[model samples]
Each structure stands twice: as C-alpha cells, then as structure tokens.
Target: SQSNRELVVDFLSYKLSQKGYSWSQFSDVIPMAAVKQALREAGDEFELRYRRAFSDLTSQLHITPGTAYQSFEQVVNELFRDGVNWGRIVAFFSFGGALCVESVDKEMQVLVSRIASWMATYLNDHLEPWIQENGGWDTFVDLYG
Candidate 1:
C-alpha cells in the first residue's frame, strides 16, 4: 500500500516540476458553483457529491502563502487513505483550489499544477473507461447515488 501511494506521489511530483508552472504563466481556480446551482448547470446530481467532498477537504487546509510541502503531503495522504480513490482524485483538485485561494504565488501555481496533472492522468487512464463501460459518469453517479 505504501508503494502504491508512493507511486502516486512520485508521479505527481514529476509532472508538477515538469510543467514548469511559474507564477508568471500559471493561474487556475477551483470551478464550483453553489451546491444547488452546480447541479442545475451541470444537469448532474453528482455535482453535490463532489462538492461535498471538496468542501470537507478544503476545510482542513489552513493554508498560508508559504505553506510547507508537508502540509500538502499530509492532506494528500489523508485523502489517499480514505479507501475511495475517486474521492481522493476530487480532493486533489479541491486542494489545488485551496492553494489558489490561499495565494497567487509560485508555490501555489506549481503545487496546483502537480495535483491537477495527477487528476488528469488518472481520469484518462482509469476512470474514463469505467465511466464509459458503466453508462458514463453521469449514469454512474445516478446509479450509485
């Protein structure tokens, strides 16, 4: 389990640095509407589930502009240990959003990129196929909801 987790962390680290996300060229936010509005706009009930998860994670991160890498690591490890990989993926994005909200600096840009890149790769390689097979993400959400 440690190895598996390390794989994820290592992959994220590599992609994060490789992206070269200088503050000059990087800015992104966590796109979320109010819970009700998000569902209406997306036409998907699952928005609430993700929004809830994101909210829970965001609440834990008391970030400063110079928040340590260990803070991110701790948050990530907590998310990873949840036994729900999908929610952990959501947490990664949520953390990125928190970083953006915390500061507009080099650290935030680089950290957010690392987290986002991991989510993108995970979605493409793993979740997308499962989504397609199980009647798509929207369908999966409704069924599982």
Candidate 2:
C-alpha cells in the first residue's frame, strides 16, 4: 500500500526533479486514453451522470488546497466503498484530474504532485489487488477497448 505511494512519489520526484517534464507524462503509466474511451462508450447519458456526480462531490467536500489530501482520501474511500469496478475506477481517476485542475486554478502548483502521490497510493494499496484479481490492464483494454 505504502509502496503505491512510493511509486507515485518516485515518478513525481523523477519527473519534477528534472526540467522540461509535463504532467501529461502520467498517461504513459495510467492508461488515461483507454479510461476516457471506456467512459465515453459507457453511454451518452453517463456523460452528464458522471459530471453531475463529480460536481456534487466537489461542491460538498469543499476541498480547498489545505485540506486536499484529507478530502481526497475521504472521497476515494467513498467511491470504492461499494467495491472495485471499471466504472468506479474511472471515477477515481477523474476525481484526481479534477483536484489537479482545482489546484492549478488556485495557483497551488505544489498540490499537483501531492495529489498524484495520493492517487497512486490508493490505486496500489486498495485497487491493485482487485485489478490483479481481475486480470490486469490487458483485460481492461480487451474488454473496454
């Protein structure tokens, strides 16, 4: 679990420690394009559905920069509280992206890495087992691709 945090932290450290790096690099490891495709293909109705759900969570949580990590943990735990599934997993990533955008808009650039760190930690600790049990990313791509 902690190593999941370490994986994110390590990647962030490596990226930020150098120059000319961009957050888009995360897509390499995160399968973001596939996730987006899955969400899009889910249904036309799901667009607004997921958007409204995300907006509601954001508004309710009041996730300011100072309380970002706590808010993140709270919302993430809530999302997976039911159980792991591809849709919920997509929501988890979407939440992280939303937080990053908020951080950037608030001029709190530092929070981006912290957000990535927490996302990675949760993915590894909580979601990794389920992902592995379900046949990993390959299966995800095959099913949803």
Candidate 3:
C-alpha cells in the first residue's frame, strides 16, 4: 500500500549498469546506495515501533514544566527515501501520500491510523534518542553515518 523500494532498486540497477555513468549534479550529493541503506534501516526500525514511544515522550515532556508538546499524525513514511529525487521516487511518494490522504474507505483509514501511531512512537523513541545523542537529525544524519 505504501512503498517505493522496488523503484529505487530499479533505478540503482540502471545507474550502475549504464555505460559511462558519470555523476550528474544530483548524483554526487545524494549517493543512491547510502540513501537506500538508511531507508532500509529506518523501515526496519521505525515503521512499527513509534506511537508507543511518541506518547511516552510527549506525556513526560508535557508535564515537565519547560517543554510543551503537540503531535501531528502522519506516518513517518512521508520522509520517503531518495538520492537524486528521480522520477520514480517522486511518483511513488506521491502515490503513497495521496492514498493516505484520499483514504475514504475503512481499510485505508486503518492503514493511515497505524502509520500515524508508529510515526509518533518513532520520534519519541528512536529519533529523540538519536537527537539527544547527536544533537539533532541533520547532525545525526551527517555525523553518525
């Protein structure tokens, strides 16, 4: 229901197989393989385990007197994976997010709910800890990996 993994794999295959595949402006920066790897790990770590952690952190944070918190419920899947913002990458995310937004049916609605829940848990648990350890997402993404 929500994935672009196959498209990424296909693109990576093409890039590697094409002759004289010099790096375009987009290629030098995004490093497709690394993006894919990070994505794979995030999928493993975050897709299911976030809402519980998110709620826990928010509850503690809200009552702590200095921090005030609010939550928005989009599945962390929105931070879709990419190296070069290729055509297929754009299409897959567009399709996935659109499906989430246009979910008028019962099954789709449940999928959306689960995504949101897991996302919250992810921020509270994994991302927060990573941030604490490395200072923030940008820094963590840069320095840790």
Mind giving the per-residue lDDT tens digits that candidate 3 earns over 1-145?
A: 0123332333333332332332131122143445445444443344245423334322332221222223222232333333222222233323333333333222333343333333344445434443456543344244324
The sequence of per-residue lDDT tens digits that candidate 1 reaches over residues 64-121 is 5455555655665566564444444444544554444333343444444444444455
lDDT of each: 0.44, 0.62, 0.33
Off by over 4 Å in 1: 1-48, 102-145
Q: Highest lDDT, which number?
A: 2
lDDT of 3: 0.33
Off by over 4 Å in 3: 1-107, 137-145
| Residue pairs clashing, model 3 | 50-121, 50-122, 51-121
Candidate 3 lDDT at 3 equals: 20
Query: Which parts of model 2 are misplaced by more than 4 Å?
Result: 1-49, 68-70
Worst ten in a row by lDDT for model 1: 30-39
Candidate 1 C-alpha error for residue 34, in Å: 28
Residue pairs with colliding backbones in model 1 are none
Q: Please, what is the TM-score per model?
A: 0.37, 0.65, 0.24
Q: lDDT by residue for model 2 over 11-32, one digit each (tens)?
A: 3433343334346434345545
Q: Which ten residues in a row have the lowest lDDT in candidate 2?
A: 13-22
